[PDB]
Design a protein around this ligand. Structure first.
Ligand code: GK3
Length: 349
């Protein structure tokens, strides 16, 4: 049953959405798509509506649109962005050219929180608990966020948290250059392309975020990739032979070996006054060798979270088939796959 759609121009972009969505108001714009806040009269929810930008413009864009839609349709967890609705005004595959994604409206991110509020140790426990709870879920489906930073973590007035803006495409080189938050939370192996990276890249970002919640300050605010690596090695120590061997990039390996060796610092002397259990956890997250970092499931059982940990309420995700990542398809094939996923969507309760 096709709802009735209505048309409006919001910032020289035409929005064609079902009647249920009212009071559309531009809230953001990028190469990803334009975003509007709206009121969903059907559910009574304040929602964010994203209009994808030229979703089927190239093979790469079509595959990306399919990827984003597949990912959002899968994620069903309190601490992870989920999909309330997806629609298109198209009546057939032949006229299908726009995809609109509907989610909860977020308002505030953790960037806003860290800047404008005093976070007690109890707040840090709760906020980091939820991130790890969501990441246990995401990682259980072999999904890596890759881009966790405070601006990608929405927090409501009750300090309730959702993970959003999954890394879906390489940032440009320019975007990662210089004194920029876009790089400060990245694991060094991914920042410098040391090796085939894994899901603990996300645990590294959690360590950086947790530290910032505790001190109110960026942990590794490098002025460039190399300055940042130096900030990192100063804290955690220069790599040993065992990690060196795992750096498959001969060039990177040769560079790190040029550095004066440095021991890991005392974290109690960096995080002065912090809960000793918070310090212990940071030590387990901020490990250079990604093989040896604590995982999300392991971290949830750490004594730091004794107050919030409930092993019966830390769910894993349904299996997630990402074999499409391996296919080279034509635009029209990606578009048809995307169409199927739009028309098969079932809203949550
Ligand atoms: C991959 C992937 N990971 N997340 C997505 C995704 C998809 C759709 C939406 C709508 C969103 C999304 C959800 C919420 C918001 C949001 O509430 N933005 C915002 C920003 C600033 C102010 C206001 C307000 N009022 C609202 C923006 C975007 C994210 O895709």
């Amino acid at each position: 049953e096709r709802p009735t759609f209505y048309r409006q121009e919001l910032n020289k972009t035409i929005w064609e959405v079902p009647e249920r969505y009212q009071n559309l108001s531009p809230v953001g714009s990028g190469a990803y798509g334009s975003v509007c806040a709206a009121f969903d009269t059907k559910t009574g929810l304040r929602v964010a509506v994203k209009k994808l930008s030229r979703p089927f413009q190239s093979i790469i864009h079509a595959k990306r649109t399919y990827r984003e839609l597949r990912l959002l349709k899968h994620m069903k967890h309190e601490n992870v962005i989920g999909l309330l609705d997806v629609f298109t005004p198209a009546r057939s595959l032949e006229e299908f050219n726009d995809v609109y994604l509907v989610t909860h409206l977020m308002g505030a991110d953790l960037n806003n929180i860290v800047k404008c509020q005093k976070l007690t140790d109890d707040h840090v426990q709760f906020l980091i608990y939820q991130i790890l709870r969501g990441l246990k879920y995401i990682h259980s489906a072999d999904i890596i966020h890759r881009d966790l930073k405070p601006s990608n973590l929405a927090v409501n007035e009750d300090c309730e948290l959702k993970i959003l803006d999954f890394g879906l495409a390489r940032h440009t080189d320019d975007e990662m250059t210089g004194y920029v938050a876009t790089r400060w939370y990245r694991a060094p192996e991914i920042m410098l392309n040391w090796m085939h990276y894994n899901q603990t890249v996300d645990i590294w970002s959690v360590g950086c975020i947790m530290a910032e919640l505790l001190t109110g300050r960026t942990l590794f605010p490098g002025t460039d990739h190399i300055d940042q690596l130096k900030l990192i090695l100063r804290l955690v120590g220069t790599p040993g032979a065992e990690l060196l061997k795992k750096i498959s990039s001969e060039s990177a390996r040769n560079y790190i070996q040029s550095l004066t060796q440095m021991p890991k610092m005392n974290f109690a002397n960096v995080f002065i006054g912090a809960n000793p259990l918070a310090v212990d956890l940071l030590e387990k997250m901020l490990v250079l060798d990604s093989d040896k970092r604590i995982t999300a499931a392991q971290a949830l059982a750490h004594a730091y979270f004794a107050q919030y940990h409930d092993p019966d309420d830390e769910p894993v995700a349904d299996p997630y088939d990402q074999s499409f990542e391996s296919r080279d398809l034509l635009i029209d094939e990606w578009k048809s796959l995307t169409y199927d996923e739009v028309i098969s969507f079932v809203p949550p309760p």
